[PDB]
Amino acid sequence: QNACTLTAENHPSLTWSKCTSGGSCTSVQGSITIDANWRWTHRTDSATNCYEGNKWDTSYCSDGPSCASKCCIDGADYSSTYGITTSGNSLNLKFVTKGQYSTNIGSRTYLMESDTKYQMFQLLGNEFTFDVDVSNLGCGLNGALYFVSMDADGGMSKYSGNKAGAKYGTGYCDSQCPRDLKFINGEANVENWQSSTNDANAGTGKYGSCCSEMDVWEANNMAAAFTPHPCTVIGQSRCEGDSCGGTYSTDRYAGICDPDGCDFNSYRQGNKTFYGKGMTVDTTKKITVVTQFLKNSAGELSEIKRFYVQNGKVIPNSESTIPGVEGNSITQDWCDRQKAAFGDVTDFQDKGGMVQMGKALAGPMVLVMSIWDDHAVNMLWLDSTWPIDGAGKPGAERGACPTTSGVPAEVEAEAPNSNVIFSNIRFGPIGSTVSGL
Numbered sequence: 295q296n297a298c299t300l301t302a303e304n305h306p307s308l309t310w311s312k313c314t315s316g317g318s319c320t321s322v323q324g325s326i327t328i329d330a331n332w333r334w335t336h337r338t339d340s341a342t343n344c345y346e347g348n349k350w351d352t353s354y355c356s357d358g359p360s361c362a363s364k365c366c367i368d369g370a371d372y373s374s375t376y377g378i379t380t381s382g383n384s385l386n387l388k389f390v391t392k393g394q395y396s397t398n399i400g401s402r403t404y405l406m407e408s409d410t411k412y413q414m415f416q417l418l419g420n421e422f423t424f425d426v427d428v429s430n431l432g433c434g435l436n437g438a439l440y441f442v443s444m445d446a447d448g449g450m451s452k453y454s455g456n457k458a459g460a461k462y463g464t465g466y467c468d469s470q471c472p473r474d475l476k477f478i479n480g481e482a483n484v485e486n487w488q489s490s491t492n493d494a495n496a497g498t499g500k501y502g503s504c505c506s507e508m509d510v511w512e513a514n515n516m517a518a519a520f521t522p523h524p525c526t527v528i529g530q531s532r533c534e535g536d537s538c539g540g541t542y543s544t545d546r547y548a549g550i551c552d553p554d555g556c557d558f559n560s561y562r563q564g565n566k567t568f569y570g571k572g573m574t575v576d577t578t579k580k581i582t583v584v585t586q587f588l589k590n591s592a593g594e595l596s597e598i599k600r601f602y603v604q605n606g607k608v609i610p611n612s613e614s615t616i617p618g619v620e621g622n623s624i625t626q627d628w629c630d631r632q633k634a635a636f637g638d639v640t641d642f643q644d645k646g647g648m649v650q651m652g653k654a655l656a657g658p659m660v661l662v663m664s665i666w667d668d669h670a671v672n673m674l675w676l677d678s679t680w681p682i683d684g685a686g687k688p689g690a691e692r693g694a695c696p697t698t699s700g701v702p703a704e705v706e707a708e709a710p711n712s713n714v715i716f717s718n719i720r721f722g723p724i725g726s727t728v729s730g731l
């Protein structure tokens with residue numbers, strides 16, 4: 295995709311903290327950019343849309359390279375159009391933003407090191423911490439902070455058709471191999487475009503974009519999970535059609551990434567009073583979330599540990615109480631037992647498990663922060679009973695939301711002013727971001 299400048303692109307600023315062994319932390323001046331799929335896509339020579347509603351203009355261009363050449367993405371009106379604001383080390387993403395001519399739903403954003411480069415993190419062996427407020431995030435919504443193995447420049451150095459780069463939030467990928475991206479590998483995803491049946495702005499193209507994914511945080515004020523998702527190809531790669539896998543496909547496991555992950559949800563692991571409104575981890579208030587990516591002596595990822603801090607008390611992750619799935623952290627062995635007790639597909643195992651996730655964590659990964667609703671499962675996998683008839687079966691109950699919650703059109707209409715606030719990002723070696731773990 296080319297880049298256009300009918301609208302100035304000014305990344306909202308966002309500071310974060312790099313911490314050293316001993317607890318000393320240094321302020322870093324970063325910023326954030328919005329993902330290209332939310333941007334205006336128009337012809338390079340006019341304001342005429344190349345993509346509008348849920349369609350491409352195929353009277354103008356009709357294949358990947360030519361649309362990538364004749365179309366561009368433009369700047370983004372962060373606050374008034376997308377409901378994205380920052381202040382200091384704090385980022386607020388609003389759910390539905392109604393402007394004069396348009397309605398924006400959700401957002402996906404990336405931390406920048408510079409105007410043209412995502413801030414890369416190498417997580418293995420290290421510690422990542424942030425504060426989050428999910429208090430205004432109800433059933434059916436997901437405020438997500440995670441890492442994916444995108445390239446720092448959005449793919450510019452790999453794909454000559456991508457002339458927009460990280461500045462315009464290009465190059466996305468995750469463990470769902472998403473096919474709704476309008477540009478992948480520097481080529482517009484216009485071939486075999488099929489409009490979504492329930493999302494007025496979306497469709498899927500011939501191609502999807504895969505890469506490793508570490509879901510540090512997927513949460514609302516009812517339920518939370520952290521989930522590694524390995525891929526048999528570590529970095530960004532293009533997939534084709536149904537072989538992409540991911541959930542907007544016929545066989546979600548048919549592709550190269552694990553679409554389920556090895557998930558830890560306190561509620562799903564059997565502790566229903568640990569996380570929620572006024573609970574041990576109280577979701578009406580700001581929560582500090584600590585994640586440690588531990589190595590074994592061979593240098594592989596052996597364990598993911600979670601701690602919470604609220605009002606100065608360190609709260610270790612809740613004990614999983616599912617019989618046979620004892621433990622409060624994610625390990626290969628724990629994941630084997632979890633999949634067994636829940637009767638779930640061992641795709642995590644088949645695609646390389648912890649060791650394969652650690653290969654991604656050893657490399658650079660992009661930090662992404664988003665807010666969204668779910669046009670496939672109404673977020674029931676996160677905060678409800680899933681499958682909907684599975685009450686009493688181990689693994690089915692994930693939160694206390696009703697099985698009728700989460701329908702995008704309904705939650706968009708009822709809770710449009712929902713929002714999530716990510717703030718106070720701290721990163722460094724183990725023990726460096728919060729004292730007294």
Ligand SMILES: *[C@@H]1O[C@H](CO)[C@@H](O[C@@H]2O[C@H](CO)[C@@H](O[C@H]3O[C@H](CO)[C@@H](O)[C@H](O)[C@@H]3O)[C@H](O)[C@H]2NC(C)=O)[C@H](O)[C@H]1NC(C)=O
Nearest residue numbers: 564565566567568569574575608609610611612613614615
């Ligand atoms: C869900 O996770 C909760 C936090 O991990 C956990 O709360 C903990 O409950 C125990 C009760 O067994 C409390 O222990 C208190 O009582 C014992 C015995 O009287 C004392 O020896 C302890 O020192 C303590 O005072 C913990 O305080 C409490 N932890 C927190 C952080 O509140 C729940 O038990 C878990 N629920 C399930 C079903 O496992």
Ligand SMILES: OC[C@H]1O[C@@H](O[C@H]2[C@H](O)[C@@H](O)[C@H](O[C@H]3[C@H](O)[C@@H](O)[C@@H](O)O[C@@H]3CO)O[C@@H]2CO)[C@H](O)[C@@H](O)[C@@H]1O
Nearest residue numbers: 331332397398399400474493495496666667668669670
């Ligand atoms: O097309 C321009 C239009 O896009 C809207 O954002 C879309 C994104 O284009 C789309 O990628 C995203 O898809 C997410 C979906 O909503 C979720 O259910 C789930 O599947 O994850 C997807 C992202 O990976 O949906 C949004 C909403 O349709 C903007 O809201 C809009 O302002 C803009 O004009």
Ligand SMILES: OC[C@H]1O[C@@H](O[C@H]2[C@H](O)[C@@H](O)[C@H](O[C@H]3[C@H](O)[C@@H](O)[C@@H](O)O[C@@H]3CO)O[C@@H]2CO)[C@H](O)[C@@H](O)[C@@H]1O
Nearest residue numbers: 470521541553554555557638667668669670671675676
């Ligand atoms: O991230 C983008 C994509 O995520 C989809 O949700 C996934 C979850 O990420 C995934 O963890 C979950 O996996 C569950 C699985 O579906 C069930 O079979 C269960 O038994 O085990 C897993 C534990 O949760 O699946 C969902 C469904 O795909 C969103 O649906 C999608 O909208 C979004 O774009």
Ligand SMILES: *[C@H]1O[C@H](CO)[C@@H](O)[C@H](O)[C@@H]1O
Nearest residue numbers: 490491492493542669670
């Ligand atoms: C069209 O089809 C989608 C496929 O996921 C359904 O979920 C929905 O009913 C939409 O109307």
